[PDB]
């Protein structure tokens, strides 16, 4: 049976980077001519596994971890990266194995009015665990004065938004991203 890489890569709806999703791929035989033998991806960096020999490499599960970031925010999506997305939104382990495929989506994710639908977490006390997910809307404490979960002095709203406009150069257009996480019945 073919694998649903099509259902995640060509997903009509993409989740935001603060509220990404994981899908388990247990029982399937893949055809990696859909990933490697194509040119829709602008970022390509496979870690620990090569871009061709991965076909005859069995792994106990594969995860398709999909989201949207900004143009230069793709460089934060790498084990160890200290970037804003890497440290407060979604962190890769330093011993990560897998592939990352990212592509520009300005024509579907950037509107002239400003796209405020895609968001990210600018405020996250401490740092996330490898593959940890946080969707909490609990009001960010900016200082030690009590905020009773309210907005005012020393009291800030935790969540912010992107504003994807067509006027941005290559640096900061929207990008649809997929991170593949492998875990030691899937082959090519």
């Amino acid at each position: 049976n073919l694998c649903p890489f099509d259902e995640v890569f060509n997903a009509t709806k993409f989740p935001s980077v603060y509220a990404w999703e994981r899908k388990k791929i247990s029982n399937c035989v893949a055809d990696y001519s859909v990933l490697y033998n194509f040119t829709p991806f602008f970022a390509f960096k496979c870690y620990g596994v090569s871009a061709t020999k991965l076909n005859d490499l069995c792994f106990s599960n594969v995860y398709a971890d999909s989201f949207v970031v900004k143009g230069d925010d793709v460089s934060q999506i790498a084990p160890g990266q200290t970037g804003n997305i890497a440290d407060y939104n979604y962190k890769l382990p330093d011993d990560f194995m897998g592939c990352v495929l990212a592509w520009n989506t300005r024509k579907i994710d950037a509107t002239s009015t400003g796209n405020y639908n895609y968001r990210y977490r600018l405020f996250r006390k401490s740092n996330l665990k490898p593959f940890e997910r946080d969707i909490s809307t609990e009001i960010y404490q900016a200082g030690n004065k009590p905020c009773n979960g309210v907005a005012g002095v020393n009291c800030y709203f935790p969540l912010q938004s992107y504003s994807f406009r067509p006027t941005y150069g290559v640096g900061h257009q929207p990008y649809r991203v997929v991170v593949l996480s492998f875990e030691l019945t899937v082959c090519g």
Partner: antibody
Amino acid sequence: EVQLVESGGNLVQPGGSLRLSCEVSGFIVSRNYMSWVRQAPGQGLEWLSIIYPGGSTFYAESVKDRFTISRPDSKNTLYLQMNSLRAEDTGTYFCARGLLEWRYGQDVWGQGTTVTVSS
Amino acid sequence: DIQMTQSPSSLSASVGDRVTITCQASQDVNEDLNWYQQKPGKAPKLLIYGAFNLETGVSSKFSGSGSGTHFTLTISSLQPEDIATYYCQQYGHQALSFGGGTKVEIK
């Protein structure tokens, strides 16, 4: 009221050490965006470093590994343990408060503290 | 570190004249340009957030435009109280940086 307190600037030799202090009023350090930007007397602004609400740090390669912006959670203070000082490091030091959304405007800095580096 | 170059480096404008400053980024940084005013013997004070919005506690005479790689502030009427320098700043990348700034005096 929002207010900032710079202090700890004093005369020093090249290669020395110095320390800044700010018992933070108007906000508290423990969970804010805070930068460090110095200005030389009669020159442009110079970005040095920035600590994030979770403790993330960024440095330019010209000032990398020399400056250590850090903070204990036990006190309401941004610390800067400064090492390997040079004559070009003469401030007029300012710590910045980052606001929310695309408004990352560092609106409130303070008055600055006088660090002079000379033989 | 992103290089932000401004022009011109200094200019003289009469009482009530119009001062307009330009600031260019070497890479695209959207509306990510915090614009400050530094009066002589005073810290820089924020004027613009988002490249086109007036900062809170600033006079309505300051209203800018430009986004991406080029940024503009038109002081619709420079005043005797506005005798000061201005500094653009980008924050679009992991290393932040400031523009050279334009020293503005009264003529």
